[PDB]
Every structure is written in structure tokens, then in C-alpha cells.
């Protein structure tokens, strides 16, 4: 009955993983075994996507979320995002799936056979939650491991192939990065931008040099923070600010994960640089801008002077001014004039869309991209009927951008709730009234009435 | 022992499922309302009544199946199986909508049975019948929506059909023809249902977060014995919490649980009154003062006028197929539409 | 002690009639700015060009509205998601025209209500309570964030946030049904089960506890005086309401643990309102309600309408009329 029942551990079956709070060895098993499942899914899913992949359809017509992640790192893909070698996808898949079994093996070992608790078997792997120095030491090691990870990405971009650059000319190509941006005025300029329209905070990063640069900074930041924490212990002010318990640490990371899920949601919805629309489908803004382009082109071909066409409201039917005067597409898409993409920027001048470039320099690849993106706009039904809510059945499509955003908003919301739940409970638990109010000492009863 | 008293003994026996005298009404009518819904959604069409498929057999799923209302041409017929329309022909009775009245009417007598059952059980157990009283609101809703409303209209066609999406259609019909959202009786109903849910959540959360520590484990559910004398949570600390968070608080446990009965029961009753109104097309559709201004001032626009424009879209776009017996033919050119769309 | 400690101890005093707390330090100013602005705009704000098409909607009482039709109107579509503080406008006149009070109100309000949630945790801590009331409030809070913040974000404009008005709300719902078939979305179905179920269980619990009040009064006084505040004992016979309700249905569809019963009351409406807040939040990214338009066809290929097709005809009626001057191009892609 080594914990494992409600009578001894104090927790019912529906909260049984709480039985593991002070069993460092079994708890180690659960984490690795769970790490097992993550890598497993990275593996199974990729092979499933590979088995289901037709290279003639866009990635985004086929319901793929992981292969687009592999293509962005510059594997298996050529100019315009054309798939030229599928074998790297197979490798990413098999290796993770294989790896999951060793992970699998290791977690099931520790959770069952291994020592329930580690702290008497080795003073180094054992830990107590309240050991402030040991905790920052673990934090410190994982910081360094993360710092290395970020530098793997730099390594791939600068030395091992490059990344897919949607903005690379000739419709996009894989490209090695040689002048990453290290100016902290840029790298940390991003963190100071407004998250509101036209700025977008870090979601606005629109070039690979800034991406690769930022991961140099973060890699060295992390490695340097690992060391700092391995060598230091928290100071007086920090000690008095936090709860030092296993549950509180959990609650702080649920807090972080939630924040991150939310940023990911907006990243995949607005950003078309590290989520190239070649792979992920167009953004919502991009599709809506693409429609205005499409019908500008068609009408202008018919003889319409699109710069002087007054639509019903008195505003331009095709072109109007943003509130700061930029020439932007008209109609409802006026809200999306912040959009930028490689198919559209050739028509941009200092004052925004340039009418001479509109009347002369629109190439057919731009008409194709604009028509393609307008008919793959991220709208679709739960059962993957594509289009507006009133569309008839026929097109089996829902944008990967919808899938990844909706899923990760849901997950971020529930991880915020998890924060409040465990943060609240950590505080009560630490103060000792998490099982309820002491009848013989009820605090309100020592307090004066309010009135 | 008279035979009436012997039968009373057996009917009021302590068994796993209590019968009672109420049961003689309750169980047959509920089983057949239920059973007729299951039967009709699984196997029966709405093709001759509505121009619609409505069963699993026809390839509908759980959201789109319905036992649909009989054709408008039936008027308010009871649609008895042995009646002039179907003449005892069970197949024809399904096709003309008999199951709808079959469900509607057995369902109604089942609800009666259920309320009587609440009275019957309260009386034998010795408790006040506030639960039966509370169930008056579901009854007013059912009666107002499924019976009164069509009896005011041209026929049972316009009552709700018994299906998930059929009921969604009814919601949207009610927006576009009745402007129901604007009706203070519905607004009182909204308040009482959303306020009921608020009371539900805030009272449960308050009890669970003012518990006394009456055991020693972290699962606090085991620290309660239904025979204890004691309050399992602190009214005193709950009161202070809410007086300081929200300004005012309950202090009286009786008024608190009475208020929980009152709020949602009172809201469903208000909504019912509004639907009785709509039985007669007695709607709160317009604000005259807005329309007199709007008609004279083409620059005057409010969310009220914008919503009527939506309403007009619903009526014209949905009526031909929604009321097929009318043979509405709307050439493209009459269909109200904004620019481009 | 020193001045800073006096202040800290006042901020966190469990003796103030209204608890302040550190969350309260942010909440109070933000809710006050939001309430004053809203009250003044609702009464006197001039028309607002919500859809960016120079077609202003009058929302305020002095400009021809009543309580039911009035609203603080969402900011201009021309603005989209740009931050539009008063200081970004050339003049208050411009700010009013373009819908600036809306931004000011909802930002201060989201902020103020988030701190309200935190404040609920904070006082439960000072009082020795369990902390999870604030979790319950997270369902309503998340719902507000959805209609005011998340849905604008995914759609690219606060012009499509929910208006601060009774009829504005209806407008929002109708346009939402046509653009997302929210009625056919399970998360919204889960919201209705949440709030119907919450109302049902509200009425049940109230009726069941009320049914089993212990006679402590006479037929002339209010039954409510049978309960005295802070009384040690219970004033109703839960055993008796279990016995009544277990027989109404059967013995085990009924609760006899007060704590399990009350946790069920908390959890049902909170969960479902979480789901429907999550429904508005994911339709915000155009993952929409089930589409069964022309899902049944016959052996030749004729469409055999179902009730889902009838809903589509309504939806389509909303689609083509809403914002009747705002679309130049055939698809309403946001």
C-alpha cells in the first residue's frame, strides 16, 4: 500500500497523481513516460501525415500540421515551397517514434520498478521541493538545455541548410542565414512594440535574420541564466515573494504555458514568415486582402479605372486611405491593411499601394497567388466543409491556421484555469487551510463586524 | 380492507421505482412520448408535411432528425389514428404527422403525471411540495410553446417540431417574424435563466470554498455525514466574503434557497406569457417613435433599425422553403440584399 | 511601523467595508474610468461610424435612443485592431466619431474585471477560505473576454466586438449565427445545457431545500425567521429531501452528500459556460458550427432538404442584409 490508496495518501483516485508529490522516483517515471507520449505522437502523426500526403495538393488542402513545421526548417522542399524530397519527413517521423520507446521504457521503469523515492539512492537526483538551492539548480540545468535547443535552430539556419524563406525572391526558397541580427535595438525592439494593430509585438517578426538573431540572444540568455541559477540561491526579496512547494512551481509553469499558448495562437493566425502561407494556407487577413486584389485585377482588365472608382458609401470601391493615409484595398478589408506578404509587397510604394504598379506591373503569379489564397481563406465548419457558414457541401477544407489557433487557444485557456486552481491551492496549502476552515478558530469570528 | 385500499397499498409500496396513483398517468404517457420521439426520429419522414427528411433512415444525424409538425392543411386537428384524416391507417398517420400530436399530447399528460407524482411523494414522505410548485414553470413553458402558440396560429405546422435543428429553426423564425429578442417577457426570462445559472454556480462555489475542516484528507467530500446536526460550511465567513467583495451578501439560508427557486421559476413564467402574446402575433416588434424618425430621416440609424433589416432578410430568404404550403415564389430581384452579398 | 507598511496594512485590511487588496488597487481606477465613460457615452455620445463606411450609428439616449436601443457603439472598422487612445485623436470630436469610448470602456473593463477575479482569490486568502470561487467567476470573465477581445482579434477589428447595448447585443448574435452557425456548434450547445441545466438545478436545489425546512415558525410569520444567522445547526432535513428526491426518481440519482451536491452545482454551469466562451473564442478563428447543407441527396442527386437546410435559408437572410453597404466583393471573409 505504498501510498496508492486514499486512506494513506489523503487523495482520492480522481486526484491520484497528487499521491506522487513526495515520491521523486515514481514522479520521475510519470514525466518521462509522458515525455514518451509526446515524442510518440510527434512520430506517429508525421508518418500518418506522410502516408496521407499527395505532393500535388497544397500542404494546407490536406490537413497537415507537422510536415509544414518540417518544411519551414528547410527540409524536403524547394522554390515556391514545392515538395522535392519526402524522405526527410520520414526520418523525422521514425526517429521520434523510435525514441519514444526508450523514453517509454525509461518512464515505465521508474514508475514501477525503480525506487519510489530517489533521495536516499543518490544525493544528486533526489530532491526536496523546499530545497531552494536544489530547485534553482534543476531550473538551471534545464535553462542550459533550452539555450542549446535555441542554438540548434541557429545552427540549422547558418550552417546546416537554412530555413524556408517565404520572402526570398523568386517566390520563396530555402536560404542560409549569414547576417543574423544581433543589434539588441532590433531584437529587443520587438518586445517593446505594442501588441495592437499595426505593431503586433513579437508576432510582427517578418524576416529570418531577425528570427535567427533572436535565437542567438535567447540561447545565450538561457545558458547564462542556467549558470546563474546553478551557482546562486534566491535572495531575500524573492524568498518572501513566493510559495516554495511542488504545487506552486506547477502553478507557475501552468501560468507560463498559458501565456505561451496564447502567443502561439496569435503567431499562427497573423504571422506568415515562420508560418509560411505556402505551407499553412493564407492568414485570415491575407485571404481578405487577396479577394480585393482578385477583383481589382478582373475589373481593371475589363477597363475599370480602379483608382477613381467610388463605391456605394463614397469610399473607393477598390482603393481608399487607411486612417494615416496609406493607400490600401477598400471594402471591409480596410481593417486588414496591416497585412504584408511577398505576393503583395511588389505593388507597394512609399504611400502604400501604388496605382502605376497596379496599372502596369501586376504579374500572373500574383493573380494566381491572390486567387488561390482568396479561395483557401481560413473559414470552414467543424466537419471540414470549407467556406462561409452558408456554403453548400463540396469542398473538404479547414485551414491548418484555424486548427492550430483554435486548439491552442482552448489549451491556453484551460492552462490559465489550471494556474488559478493550483496557485490558489498552493497558497492555502502553504498556509494550512486548504482542507477547510478550523471550526475551533474560525478567523472571521475574531474579526470585528463590518457594520 | 376495501379493494381500493388494497390497490393503494400496492401502488404506494417502497420499491426501487415508486409507482403511485400518479404512475398510472405518468409511466404510459412518458414512455409513449419518449418512444414516439425515438421511433419518429429513427424511421419517419417529414416529406409530405414539410418537404424534409427527418429520420436516421433517410440519412439524418442526431442534430437534424425531428418528429416534425403535421402539414398546415391539417389545421389544429387532434390527428387521432382513428380519426377522419388517417382512418386507422398507421402508415398514413405517420406520414401526415400523427406522431407529433401523439408526442405532444401524451407528453402533456406525462408532465401532469410527473407533477402529480411530486405531490404524491411529498405528501407520503411528509415534505412541503415546493418542488412540484417549481415544476409549474416547465409546464407553463411547454403548454405555452407547444400548445397555445400553434392554437393561436393557423395550425400545428407552426408549433415547434421535436428536433435539435428543428428547434434552432424555431428560434430563428421567432427572431425574424416576431422579433422575440425585443420582447420584455423573453428578457425577463433570459434574466431568470442566466440568473438561475449564476445562483447555481455561485452558491455551489461558495459552499465548497467555505467548508469547515471536518476530516483530515485532501478529498473534502468524505468529511460529510448526512445525519450530522452541523452546517457543513460557514454562513458567517461566506457572508463576510461577499459583503466585502460584492457589497451585499445573503445572511439567511432559508431566503437563499427560496430565492433560488423563485428566480428561474419566475423567469420561465414570464417567457410563457410572452409566447401567449405571440400566439396572436401580439409582438413587441417595433418602436413607433424610431420608425417615424427613420422614415423621415435617412441618416438616423440605430441597432434597432439594423436588426429589423436582418429580420426582413430572414423572412424573405427562409419563407418559401419553411412554409412550402404557401407556394411563395420570390424572383431573385425581390429578395432583399445589401451590396455585393 | 514605516509609512509604506501602514499603507500595505490598510490595502489588505480585512476590516474595510469593501475589501481593497492589491488587485483592488488596479480594479478600482479601471472600473471607475470604464463606468463613468460608459454612463456618459450611453446618454450623450454622438453617432459612431462603426463599420468604417462613413455611415454613423446613433447609440445614445440624447440622439434618439431609448434604453432598449441604446448602445455604446464599437469603434470604426477603419481602425481595425489599432490602439486608439484619446491622445491618438486630433480632437475629442474625431475620437467620438470613430468610436473611441468603446475601446476605452472595454479595455478598462476587461482589466478591472480580471482584477476583480484576482480580488476574489485575494480576500479568500486573507479570510482563511478555500480559493476556488475565483475559478467559478472565470467562466463569466472568459465569456466577456471572448465577445470583447478574442472575437475582434481573430476577425481583425473591434468593429465586430459586441456592442455595449441591449439591441447591439442582439445584432451581434444574429450576425454571429449567419457567419458561424453558432447554433450548430457543440460548444454553444454545451453553453445552453450549461445555463438551462444551471437554472434547472438552481430551481431543484432551492425547491428541495425549501421543501424540507424544519418547522421552526408559525403559519403567520415568514418561514425565513426559522433560521438565525450564524446558527450552529442546519435548518433543513437533507435526509428528508434525499428521501423525497430519491423516490421522485430513484435512490441513487439523488445526492445525500451536501458537499458532492454543492460541488455539482458549481461545476455544471461553470463547465458549460467555459465551453461556450471557448466556442466564441474558436469561431473567432472561423472554426464554425457543423455544416449539413445538402447533406442528404436522393438516388438521382436531388437535394432532399433537412432542418439544417432550413436554418441555412435563415442564415443566408442575415448574411445578405447585415452591414448592407459595407461589402464590395462577393465573400464576407471576416
Amino acid at each position: 500500500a505504498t501510498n496508492r490508496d486514499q486512506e494513506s495518501s489523503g487523495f482520492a483516485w480522481w486526484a491520484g497523481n497528487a499521491r506522487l508529490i513526495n515520491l521523486s522516483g515514481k514522479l520521475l517515471g510519470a514525466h518521462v513516460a509522458h515525455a514518451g507520449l509526446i515524442v510518440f505522437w510527434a512520430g506517429a502523426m508525421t508518418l500518418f501525415e506522410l502516408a496521407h500526403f499527395i505532393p500535388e495538393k497544397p500542404m494546407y488542402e490536406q490537413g497537415l500540421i507537422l510536415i509544414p513545421h518540417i518544411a519551414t526548417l528547410g527540409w524536403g522542399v524547394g522554390p515556391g515551397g514545392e515538395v522535392v524530397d519526402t524522405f526527410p519527413f520520414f526520418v523525422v517521423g521514425v526517429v521520434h517514434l523510435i525514441s519514444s520507446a526508450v523514453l517509454g521504457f525509461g518512464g515505465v521503469y521508474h514508475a514501477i520498478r525503480g525506487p519510489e523515492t530517489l533521495e536516499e539512492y543518490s544525493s544528486f537526483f533526489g530532491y526536496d521541493w523546499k530545497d531552494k538551492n536544489k530547485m534553482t539548480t534543476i531550473l538551471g540545468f534545464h535553462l542550459i538545455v533550452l539555450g542549446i535547443g535555441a542554438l540548434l535552430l541557429v545552427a540549422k539556419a547558418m550552417f546546416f541548410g537554412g530555413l524556408y524563406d517565404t520572402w526570398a525572391p523568386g517566390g520563396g526558397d530555402v536560404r542560409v542565414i549569414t547576417n543574423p541580427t544581433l543589434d539588441p535595438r532590433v531584437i529587443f525592439g520587438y518586445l517593446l512594440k505594442s501588441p495592437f494593430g499595426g505593431e503586433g509585438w513579437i508576432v510582427s517578426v517578418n524576416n529570418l535574420e531577425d528570427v535567427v538573431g533572436g535565437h542567438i540572444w535567447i540561447g545565450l540568455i538561457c545558458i547564462a541564466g542556467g549558470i546563474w541559477h546553478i551557482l546562486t540561491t534566491p535572495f531575500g526579496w524573492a524568498r518572501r515573494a513566493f510559495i516554495w512547494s511542488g504545487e506552486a512551481y506547477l502553478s507557475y509553469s501552468l501560468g507560463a504555458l498559458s501565456m505561451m499558448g496564447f502567443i502561439a495562437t496569435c503567431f499562427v493566425w497573423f504571422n506568415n514568415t515562420v508560418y509560411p502561407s505556402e505551407f499553412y494556407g493564407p492568414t485570415g487577413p491575407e485571404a481578405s486582402q487577396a479577394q480585393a486584389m482578385t477583383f481589382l485585377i478582373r475589373d481593371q482588365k475589363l477597363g475599370a479605372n480602379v483608382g477613381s472608382a467610388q463605391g456605394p458609401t463614397g469610399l473607393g470601391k477598390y482603393l481608399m486611405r487607411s486612417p494615416t493615409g496609406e493607400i490600401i484595398f477598400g471594402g471591409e478589408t480596410m481593417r486588414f491593411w496591416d497585412f504584408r506578404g511577398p505576393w503583395l509587397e511588389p505593388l507597394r510604394g512609399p504611400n502604400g499601394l501604388d496605382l502605376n504598379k497596379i496599372k502596369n506591373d501586376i504579374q500572373p503569379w500574383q493573380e494566381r497567388r491572390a486567387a488561390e489564397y482568396m479561395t483557401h481563406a481560413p473559414l470552414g465548419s467543424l466537419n471540414s466543409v470549407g467556406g462561409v457558414a452558408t456554403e453548400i457541401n463540396s469542398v473538404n477544407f479547414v485551414s491548418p491556421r484555424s486548427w492550430l489557433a483554435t486548439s491552442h487557444f482552448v489549451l491556453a485557456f484551460f492552462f490559465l484555469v489550471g494556474h488559478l486552481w493550483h496557485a490558489g491551492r498552493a497558497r492555502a496549502a502553504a498556509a494550512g487551510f486548504e482542507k477547510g476552515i478550523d471550526r475551533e478558530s474560525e478567523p472571521v469570528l475574531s474579526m470585528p463586524s463590518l457594520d | 380492507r376495501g379493494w381500493f385500499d388494497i390497490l393503494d397499498d400496492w401502488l404506494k409500496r417502497d420499491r426501487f421505482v415508486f409507482v403511485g396513483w400518479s404512475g398510472i398517468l405518468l409511466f404510459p404517457c412518458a414512455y409513449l412520448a419518449l418512444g414516439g420521439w425515438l421511433t419518429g426520429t429513427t424511421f419517419v419522414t417529414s416529406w409530405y408535411t414539410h418537404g424534409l427528411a427527418s429520420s436516421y433512415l433517410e440519412g439524418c444525424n442526431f442534430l437534424t432528425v425531428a418528429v416534425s409538425t403535421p402539414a398546415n392543411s391539417m389545421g389544429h386537428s387532434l390527428l387521432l389514428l382513428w380519426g377522419p384524416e388517417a382512418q386507422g391507417d398507421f402508415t398514413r398517420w405517420c406520414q401526415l404527422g400523427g406522431l407529433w400530436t401523439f408526442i405532444a399530447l401524451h407528453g402533456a399528460f406525462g408532465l401532469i403525471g410527473f407533477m402529480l407524482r411530486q405531490f404524491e411523494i411529498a405528501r407520503l414522505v411528509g415534505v412541503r411540495p415546493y418542488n412540484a410548485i417549481a415544476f409549474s414553470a416547465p409546464i407553463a413553458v411547454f403548454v405555452s410553446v407547444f400548445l397555445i402558440y400553434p392554437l393561436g396560429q393557423s395550425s400545428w405546422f407552426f408549433a415547434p417540431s421535436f428536433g435539435v435543428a428543428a428547434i434552432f429553426r424555431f428560434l430563428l423564425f421567432f427572431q425574424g417574424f416576431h422579433n422575440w429578442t425585443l420582447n420584455p417577457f423573453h428578457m425577463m426570462g433570459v434574466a431568470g435563466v442566466l440568473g438561475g445559472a449564476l445562483l447555481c454556480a455561485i452558491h455551489g462555489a461558495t459552499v465548497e470554498n467555505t467548508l469547515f475542516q471536518d476530516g483530515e484528507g485532501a478529498s473534502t467530500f468524505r468529511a460529510f455525514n448526512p445525519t450530522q446536526a452541523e452546517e457543513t460550511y460557514s454562513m458567517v465567513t461566506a457572508n463576510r466574503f461577499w459583503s466585502q467583495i460584492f457589497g451585499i451578501a445573503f445572511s439567511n439560508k432559508r431566503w437563499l434557497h427560496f430565492f433560488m427557486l423563485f428566480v428561474p421559476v419566475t423567469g420561465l413564467w414570464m417567457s410563457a406569457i410572452g409566447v401567449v402574446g405571440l400566439a396572436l402575433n401580439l409582438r413587441s416588434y417595433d418602436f413607433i417613435s424610431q420608425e417615424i424618425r427613420a422614415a423621415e430621416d435617412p441618416e438616423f440609424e440605430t441597432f434597432y433599425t439594423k436588426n429589423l433589416l436582418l429580420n426582413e432578410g430572414i423572412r424573405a430568404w427562409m419563407a418559401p422553403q419553411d412554409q412550402p404550403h404557401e407556394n411563395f415564389v420570390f424572383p431573385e430581384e425581390v429578395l432583399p440584399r445589401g451590396n455585393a452579398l | 511601523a514605516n509609512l509604506w507598511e501602514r499603507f500595505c496594512n490598510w490595502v489588505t485590511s480585512t476590516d474595510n467595508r469593501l475589501y481593497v487588496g492589491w488587485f483592488g488597487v488596479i480594479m478600482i481606477p479601471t472600473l471607475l474610468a470604464a463606468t463613468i465613460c460608459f454612463v456618459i457615452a450611453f446618454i450623450a455620445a454622438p453617432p459612431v461610424d462603426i463599420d468604417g463606411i462613413r455611415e454613423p450609428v446613433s447609440g445614445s439616449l440624447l440622439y434618439g435612443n431609448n434604453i432598449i436601443t441604446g448602445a455604446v457603439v464599437p469603434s470604426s472598422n477603419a481602425i481595425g485592431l489599432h490602439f486608439y487612445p484619446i491622445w491618438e485623436a486630433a480632437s475629442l470630436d474625431e475620437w467620438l466619431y470613430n468610436g473611441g469610448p468603446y475601446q476605452l470602456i472595454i479595455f478598462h473593463f476587461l482589466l478591472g474585471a480580471s482584477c476583480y477575479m484576482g480580488r476574489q482569490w485575494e480576500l479568500s486568502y486573507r479570510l482563511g477560505m478555500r480559493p476556488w470561487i475565483c475559478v467559478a467567476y472565470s467562466a463569466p470573465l472568459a465569456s466577456a473576454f471572448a465577445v470583447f477581445l478574442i472575437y475582434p482579434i481573430g476577425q481583425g477589428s473591434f468593429s465586430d466586438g459586441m456592442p455595449l447595448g441591449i439591441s447591439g447585443t442582439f445584432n451581434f448574435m444574429i450576425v454571429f449565427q449567419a457567419e458561424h452557425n453558432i447554433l450548430m456548434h457543440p460548444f454553444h450547445q454545451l453553453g445552453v445545457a450549461g445555463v438551462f441545466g444551471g437554472a434547472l438545478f438552481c430551481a431543484m436545489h432551492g425547491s428541495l431545500v425549501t421543501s424540507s425546512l424544519i418547522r421552526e415558525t408559525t403559519e403567520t410569520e415568514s418561514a425565513n425567521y426559522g433560521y438565525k444567522f450564524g446558527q450552529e445547526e442546519e435548518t433543513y432535513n437533507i435526509v428528508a429531501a434525499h428521501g423525497y428526491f430519491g423516490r421522485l426518481i430513484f435512490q441513487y440519482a439523488s445526492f445525500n452528500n451536501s458537499r458532492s451536491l454543492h460541488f455539482f452545482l458549481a461545476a455544471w454551469p461553470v463547465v458549460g459556460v467555459w465551453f461556450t466562451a471557448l466556442g466564441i473564442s474558436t469561431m473567432a478563428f472561423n472554426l464554425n458550427g457543423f455544416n449539413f447543407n445538402h447533406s442528404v441527396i436522393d438516388a438521382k442527386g436531388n437535394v432532399i432538404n433537412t432542418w439544417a437546410d432550413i436554418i441555412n435559408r435563415a442564415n443566408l437572410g442575415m448574411e445578405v442584409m447585415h452591414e448592407r453597404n459595407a461589402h464590395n466583393f462577393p465573400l464576407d471573409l471576416a
Partner: peptide, 30 residues
């Protein structure tokens, strides 16, 4: 006159809030 009427009722309710909070029946423990 209609604007004034809506504002007056609204103002009465805000005054009610005040008295309901600050001049409530104090709850006491008997």
C-alpha cells in the same frame, strides 16, 4: 422628457445601491 425619465430611474437605482450596501441591516450572530 423620455431621456430625463430613463436617467432618473437609473440614478434612483444607483442611490439604492448605496443605501443597500452602506445602510443595510447589519447581519449579526444570534
Amino acid at each position: 422628457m423620455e431621456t430625463i425619465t430613463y436617467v432618473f430611474i437609473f440614478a434612483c437605482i444607483i442611490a439604492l445601491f448605496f443605501f443597500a450596501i452602506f445602510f443595510r441591516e447589519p447581519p449579526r450572530i444570534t
